[PDB]
Amino acid sequence: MGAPPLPPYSAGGREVTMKKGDILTLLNSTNKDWWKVEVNDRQGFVPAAYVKKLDSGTGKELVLALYDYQEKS
């Protein structure tokens, strides 16, 4: 809890629910605000500002969520 404000623009499509401490499979990071990952067998784009890559020394490209977020339109 206690995450920053969302960006002005938006990717434009379907997203994926993320929870604080969840490991989402990084797919695309072309954007510095929206990162496309896969969680709960679902692919979508989430705000990187809410999550944070996890590379302590494993090699695999995985990112951990910092703040809980849920799709809302």
mmCIF file of C-alpha atoms in Angstrom:
data_model
loop_
_atom_site.group_PDB
_atom_site.id
_atom_site.type_symbol
_atom_site.label_atom_id
_atom_site.label_comp_id
_atom_site.label_asym_id
_atom_site.label_seq_id
_atom_site.Cartn_x
_atom_site.Cartn_y
_atom_site.Cartn_z
ATOM 1 C CA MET A 1 0.000 0.000 0.000
ATOM 2 C CA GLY A 2 1.050 3.599 -0.567
ATOM 3 C CA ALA A 3 1.901 3.584 -4.266
ATOM 4 C CA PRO A 4 2.429 6.598 -6.565
ATOM 5 C CA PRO A 5 -0.222 8.083 -8.892
ATOM 6 C CA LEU A 6 -0.951 6.425 -12.236
ATOM 7 C CA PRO A 7 0.426 7.870 -15.502
ATOM 8 C CA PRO A 8 -1.453 10.292 -17.795
ATOM 9 C CA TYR A 9 -1.713 7.952 -20.782
ATOM 10 C CA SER A 10 -2.449 4.224 -20.939
ATOM 11 C CA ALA A 11 -1.385 1.147 -22.904
ATOM 12 C CA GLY A 12 -4.804 0.342 -24.333
ATOM 13 C CA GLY A 13 -6.001 -3.207 -23.794
ATOM 14 C CA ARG A 14 -6.377 -5.898 -21.142
ATOM 15 C CA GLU A 15 -4.381 -5.945 -17.904
ATOM 16 C CA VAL A 16 -3.650 -8.463 -15.148
ATOM 17 C CA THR A 17 -4.370 -8.263 -11.419
ATOM 18 C CA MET A 18 -1.259 -8.123 -9.238
ATOM 19 C CA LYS A 19 -0.683 -8.459 -5.492
ATOM 20 C CA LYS A 20 2.083 -7.084 -3.271
ATOM 21 C CA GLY A 21 4.713 -9.815 -3.219
ATOM 22 C CA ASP A 22 3.521 -11.623 -6.336
ATOM 23 C CA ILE A 23 5.954 -12.856 -8.986
ATOM 24 C CA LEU A 24 4.873 -11.835 -12.486
ATOM 25 C CA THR A 25 6.606 -13.209 -15.580
ATOM 26 C CA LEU A 26 8.194 -10.289 -17.427
ATOM 27 C CA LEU A 27 7.325 -10.330 -21.131
ATOM 28 C CA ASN A 28 7.903 -6.812 -22.456
ATOM 29 C CA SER A 29 9.313 -3.649 -20.881
ATOM 30 C CA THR A 30 9.429 -1.367 -23.922
ATOM 31 C CA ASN A 31 7.666 1.204 -21.742
ATOM 32 C CA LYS A 32 9.063 2.810 -18.590
ATOM 33 C CA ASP A 33 5.600 3.113 -17.045
ATOM 34 C CA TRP A 34 3.690 0.080 -18.317
ATOM 35 C CA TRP A 35 5.261 -3.384 -18.251
ATOM 36 C CA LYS A 36 3.706 -6.417 -19.940
ATOM 37 C CA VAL A 37 3.871 -9.479 -17.690
ATOM 38 C CA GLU A 38 2.009 -12.718 -16.982
ATOM 39 C CA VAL A 39 0.338 -13.617 -13.685
ATOM 40 C CA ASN A 40 -2.305 -16.117 -12.578
ATOM 41 C CA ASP A 41 -2.181 -17.640 -16.062
ATOM 42 C CA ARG A 42 -3.128 -14.224 -17.442
ATOM 43 C CA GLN A 43 -1.152 -11.862 -19.677
ATOM 44 C CA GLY A 44 -1.448 -8.091 -19.426
ATOM 45 C CA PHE A 45 0.244 -4.756 -18.771
ATOM 46 C CA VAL A 46 0.800 -3.380 -15.267
ATOM 47 C CA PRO A 47 2.332 -0.159 -13.886
ATOM 48 C CA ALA A 48 6.026 -0.764 -13.209
ATOM 49 C CA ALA A 49 5.758 1.984 -10.593
ATOM 50 C CA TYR A 50 3.702 -0.500 -8.577
ATOM 51 C CA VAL A 51 6.106 -3.412 -9.032
ATOM 52 C CA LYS A 52 9.871 -3.948 -9.031
ATOM 53 C CA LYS A 53 12.155 -6.357 -10.888
ATOM 54 C CA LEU A 54 13.688 -9.118 -8.766
ATOM 55 C CA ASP A 55 17.251 -10.039 -9.726
ATOM 56 C CA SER A 56 19.071 -11.016 -6.532
ATOM 57 C CA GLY A 57 21.154 -13.545 -8.441
ATOM 58 C CA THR A 58 19.015 -16.123 -10.226
ATOM 59 C CA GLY A 59 19.223 -14.967 -13.831
ATOM 60 C CA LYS A 60 15.582 -15.580 -14.715
ATOM 61 C CA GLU A 61 13.658 -12.472 -15.767
ATOM 62 C CA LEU A 62 11.082 -12.156 -12.985
ATOM 63 C CA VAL A 63 9.548 -9.148 -11.233
ATOM 64 C CA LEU A 64 7.893 -8.825 -7.824
ATOM 65 C CA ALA A 65 4.906 -6.596 -7.071
ATOM 66 C CA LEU A 66 5.233 -3.889 -4.419
ATOM 67 C CA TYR A 67 1.678 -2.549 -4.232
ATOM 68 C CA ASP A 68 -1.648 -4.313 -4.769
ATOM 69 C CA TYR A 69 -3.481 -3.349 -7.958
ATOM 70 C CA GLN A 70 -6.619 -4.464 -9.796
ATOM 71 C CA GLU A 71 -8.007 -3.693 -13.252
ATOM 72 C CA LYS A 72 -10.613 -0.923 -13.167
ATOM 73 C CA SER A 73 -12.436 0.700 -16.086
#
